[PDB]
Design a protein around this ligand. Structure first.
Ligand SMILES: CC(C)C[C@H]1NC(=O)N(CC(=O)Nc2ccc(C(F)(F)F)cc2)C1=O
Lengths: 215, 215
């Protein structure tokens, strides 16, 4: 099957225009129809676009679907942004019986200034090593909007297994914090030169690295 | 045009069978295919049923779709109910003029067992101390239910400033995780013999202690 690649997040202030892209990994974007679903936090999904650019009745003309054959993408363009437009947006298409959804885009209608995350990566604590645990923690604090993507490297290879990332929560400064932790065994930790935690926010990626040391 | 009516919520104990109905307001349930989506907190939805009763790869066979033409409904039936099945469920169908979703059913799995937190306390990294910061993190994981309280100590004394604890979130093991972080200056960290993180959950307290290094 093909994938549909959406940006993890977008933001803009009220009244502005935002575009959300949906890139088809293989085949022709024009070969099958693209739908867009809005899911407001705590709500059921709603279709805002079907068949690339058709609006269901009740969906404001502020929402526009398009297809860019040159880039093999679909886009949802929302003009005149309102606070009610804050939601996850999903694109969806198919090859044959295989329905393919995008990973979803969080749209934030800015309610406060943007803030870039503080990122701190901690190597295993002495105590946990004695319980046969080498959990690493990546603390991510003081950010806005509340949407982040976290990726871990063992040396330069993506890690998949043993990653958990908490749902960002607003702290006492009204900015978001979260932690990602990678539950390594001491064997895994020592068996690599270094581990890295990459945090993506508002399309800038920061990275921190830790390594077994002599102390 | 039509709507799909689902129960707002259903509850059941492990091992039992739960049924979630989806009633089509207008036109025949059998005129168009029904899909079912599962969605866990802070995650994107997944397909559990398509074309009324087909299970995707990797969906447990405990999930069964059906159609009842006489009550003009579709049902998702979950057998041998597991804690991991706690989620929102959405039915979805079509009418050429739109893709239509149900309002969603929140399924609660009753009688989940109390689970004590794993607590790991990380002293400041050499790298953050070099950048003039001395944040500690207390990683709290695998606890149920999803409520903790955290107190910090500098030596034996209560820490009254610089503490933040994230809102617990449910992780892939269906238990909660949170981090408490204390934002010390390097001078504060080095001025004490130790700092401690005390995690209380269901009346039981776990305490961890870290001290400045010697290298
Ligand atoms: C084999 C396929 C039919 C199912 C498989 N393919 C795929 O794209 N997913 C992810 C998925 O269903 N995502 C999804 C994302 C959003 C929604 C929506 F629109 F909010 F209801 C519904 C579904 C799957 O679980």
């Amino acid at each position: 099957n093909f994938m549909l690649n959406q940006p993890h997040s977008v933001s803009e202030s009220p009244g502005k225009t935002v575009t959300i892209s949906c890139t088809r990994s293989s085949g022709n974007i024009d070969s099958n129809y693209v739908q867009w679903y809005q899911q407001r936090p705590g709500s059921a999904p709603i279709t805002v676009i079907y068949e690339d650019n058709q609006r269901p009745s009740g969906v404001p003309d502020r929402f526009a679907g398009s297809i860019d054959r040159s880039s093999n993408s679909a886009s949802l363009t929302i003009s005149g942004l309102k606070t009610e437009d804050e939601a996850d947006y999903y694109c969806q298409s198919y090859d044959a019986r295989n329905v393919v959804f995008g990973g979803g885009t969080r749209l934030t209608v800015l309610g406060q200034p943007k803030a870039a995350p503080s990122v701190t990566l901690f190597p295993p604590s002495s105590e946990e090593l004695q319980a046969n645990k080498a959990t690493l923690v990546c603390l991510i604090s003081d950010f806005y909007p509340g949407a982040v993507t976290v990726a871990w490297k063992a040396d330069s290879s993506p890690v998949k297994a043993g990653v958990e990332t908490t749902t960002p929560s607003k702290q006492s400064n009204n900015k978001y914090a979260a932690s990602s932790y990678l539950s390594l065994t001491p064997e895994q930790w020592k068996s690599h030169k270094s581990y890295s935690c990459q945090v993506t926010h508002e399309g800038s990626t920061v990275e921190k690295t830790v390594a077994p040391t002599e102390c």
